[PDB]
Amino acid sequence: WAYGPVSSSLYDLTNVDTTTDNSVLEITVYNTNIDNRHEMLTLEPLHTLLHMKWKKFAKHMFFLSFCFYFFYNITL
């Protein structure tokens, strides 16, 4: 899409978007025996895919879970 200093790179999500048995994203997040993920989760499609999943549904579900747990705690 590039016009000038602006441009729209169109990345790929063939085997990256967790819609496969063993995707690259679920591997990169669920592999805790590598100890480098603080850098790997800043890569090109991984970072913004996490961001998009988050702002689409994970923020909502996480805040709902926080509210339910806070009410369970205050009622305890």
Q: Interface with its own copies by CB under 8 A: which residues?
A: 1-14, 17-19, 25-26, 29-30, 37-38, 41, 44-45, 48-50, 52-54, 56-58, 61-62
End-to-end CA distance of the chain: 56
Q: How far is the CB of 56 from its own copies (least distance, A)?
A: 6
DSSP label at residue 21: T
Q: How far is the CB of 51 from its own copies (least distance, A)?
A: 9
Q: How far is the CB of 49 from its own copies (least distance, A)?
A: 6
